[PDB]
From a paper:
Our work has revealed that Lsd18 has an extra‐large substrate‐binding pocket that allows the polyene to adopt different conformations within the enzyme pocket.
To visualize how the substrate molecule binds in the active site, we determined the crystal structure of Lsd18‐FAD in complex with a diene substrate analogue, 1. Each Lsd18 contains one FAD, one substrate analogue, and one chloride ion. No electron density was observed for the oxazolidinone head group of 1, and therefore it was not modeled. The conformation of Lsd18 in the Lsd18‐FAD‐1 complex structure is nearly identical to that in the Lsd18‐FAD structure (RMSD = 0.13 Å). In this configuration, transfer of an oxygen atom from the reactive C4a‐hydroperoxyflavin to the alkene is expected to produce an (R,R) epoxide, which is consistent with the structure of lasalocid A. We propose that the subpocket, formed by Y218, V252, and V342, and the nearby I72, determines the alkene binding orientation. In our crystal structure, the subpocket accommodates C19‐ethyl of 1, presumably generating binding free energy and promoting catalysis.
Author numbering: 20 to 487
């Protein structure tokens, strides 16, 4: 019984559809894109050309919604990389000592990740993906949404799709501001923090022996230094490839040309390690860029009027600077927030509003982590009323930096820091007495004086071929 319509069949739409099909009789997913039969790039998810880190916090929720997905990913060549044991990371505070595993991430092409999630979701026959279809309007009125009007691209025919619940998951380019204006609702408060960050990515074929068990390698900006923030990330993906994404804020953007890419990875960031490693590998693709890096949030949950039967989640409600790697995990937390409200309130009036407020809570940690570190870069453009960004940014940063510095050299602080950063634990967790006690106990290991690479990792950067 009951029907749901989901706008957008990307990550949030597939996760939310899988969840909803366990609560309603049918789910219809409307997407303007065409979908490949295999793990290919598609125009509706251009960000799949860039490195995607799936932190443990989101991975565990994906697993809860779509059992078997994590193993299916690893089974297809995705890498499980332990954090911090499997990462070689030059943080703002220095090299991270590679303590034993506290958390993990899943490393693969976003195209394979999307394909795996969609194929698993659509095994449920009561979920139908309706491709190459435009969303024209929300049906109903400002009091209650009752479906959507859509247009088949090939035919041109329009039709009404009824729904007891409409969920907008159309991503960063979502048209919900327009759709909700057409209903007669006031505009939501828009909040943004725009560092001017630009991404540049190439794919490489890794040296053959390093195609597995190779670490995630990252060189981070120093958010406290009054210079443009620049980063470089090397991440293993399936079938023996490396995806390498470099990034820079206003005044430090990476160039678009292949030769300037490798130069930036060496000299544009604070340590040349990623540039040194890509010199061991064979480039496979030319440079792809992206400017979709603004932290932007729409406060739908605080609107004076909200229609029954309408929920917005994923990048459509809150989108983040991708260098922090939280977007997919925030979407998953948001799907669970909607599920929690469905279990509590069924489809009573107040469900959609309660879900929208719960979704605002679900994305808040990712929002604070990204915005608190972006707000400081030169020339950052901001629009916010959040006193955590406007009043108490300094002492929050002094607490952040004390934790971040100590996490590089203290196993207990690192465990707490990565639990929060993978969105496996909430912000309050860091106020636990045991964590601040370990912070005060200070470093337990020396600061690494060189990249903490293992000999057996660097040994696999060469073949030994030209040697008798
Ligand atoms: C460069 C970059 C790097 C990133 N790296 C990471 C990372 O390392 N880790 C991480 O967790 N996240 C990362 N993200 C964020 C992640 O890509 C998004 O958070 C995630 O895709 C959000 O899913 P979504 O379903 O809300 O939107 P999307 O995945 O973008 O899906 C939106 C869907 O809606 C459809 N659609 C869009 N507009 C319309 C329309 N008008 N009508 C109909 N259908 C429409 C699209 O075709 C698509 O199918 C990165 C993002 C970028 C840009
Ligand atoms: Cl993009």
């Amino acid at each position: 019984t009951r029907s749901a319509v989901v706008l957008g069949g990307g990550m949030a739409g597939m996760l939310v559809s899988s969840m909803l099909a366990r609560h309603v009789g049918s789910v219809t997913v409307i997407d303007r894109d065409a979908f490949p039969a295999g793990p290919d790039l598609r125009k509706g998810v251009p960000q799949a050309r860039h490195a995607h880190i799936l932190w443990s916090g989101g991975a565990r929720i994906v697993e809860e919604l779509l059992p078997g997905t994590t193993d299916r990913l690893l089974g297809a060549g995705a890498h499980r990389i332990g954090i911090p044991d499997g990462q070689v990371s030059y943080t703002a505070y220095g090299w991270q000592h590679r303590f034993p595993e506290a958390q993990f991430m899943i490393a693969c092409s976003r195209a394979l990740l999307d394909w795996t999630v969609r194929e698993e979701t659509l095994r449920e026959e009561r979920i139908a993906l309706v491709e190459k279809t435009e969303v024209l309007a929300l049906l109903g009125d400002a009091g209650r949404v009752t479906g959507v009007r859509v247009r088949d691209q090939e035919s041109g025919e329009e039709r009404e799709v009824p729904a007891d619940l409409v969920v907008d998951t159309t991503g960063r380019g979502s048209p919900s501001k327009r759709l909700l204006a057409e209903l007669g609702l006031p505009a939501p408060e828009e909040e943004f923090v725009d560092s001017g960050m630009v991404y540049a990515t190439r794919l490489f074929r890794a040296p053959e022996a390093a195609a597995t068990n190779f670490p995630l390698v990252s060189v981070h900006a120093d958010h406290r230094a009054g210079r443009p923030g620049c980063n470089a990330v090397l991440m293993p993906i399936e079938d023996g490839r490396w995806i390498v994404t470099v990034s820079g804020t206003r005044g430090g953007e990476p160039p678009a040309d292949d030769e300037g890419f490798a130069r930036f990875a060496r000299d544009g960031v604070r340590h040349p390690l990623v540039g040194e490693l890509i010199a061991k590998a064979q480039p496979l693709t030319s440079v792809e860029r992206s400017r979709s890096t603004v932290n932007r949030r729409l406060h739908y949950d605080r609107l004076a009027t909200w229609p029954e039967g309408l929920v917005v989640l994923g990048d459509a409600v809150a989108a983040f600077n991708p260098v922090y790697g939280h977007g997919m995990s925030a979407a998953a937390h948001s799907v669970l927030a909607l599920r929690s409200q469905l279990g509590q309130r069924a489809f009573q009036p107040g469900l959609a509003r309660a879900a929208q407020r719960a979704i605002a809570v679900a994305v808040d940690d990712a929002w604070v982590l990204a915005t608190s570190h972006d707000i400081g870069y030169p020339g950052c453009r901001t629009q916010t009323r959040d006193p955590r960004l406007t009043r108490h940014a300094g002492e929050r940063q002094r607490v952040t930096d004390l934790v971040g510095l100590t996490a590089t050299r203290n196993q207990v602080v690192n465990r707490a820091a990565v639990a929060l950063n993978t969105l496996s634990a909430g912000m309050a967790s860091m106020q636990d007495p045991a964590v601040m006690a370990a912070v005060r106990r200070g470093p337990e290991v020396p600061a690494p004086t060189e990249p903490p690479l293992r000999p057996d990792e660097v040994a696999r950067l060469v073949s030994g071929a030209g040697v008798t």
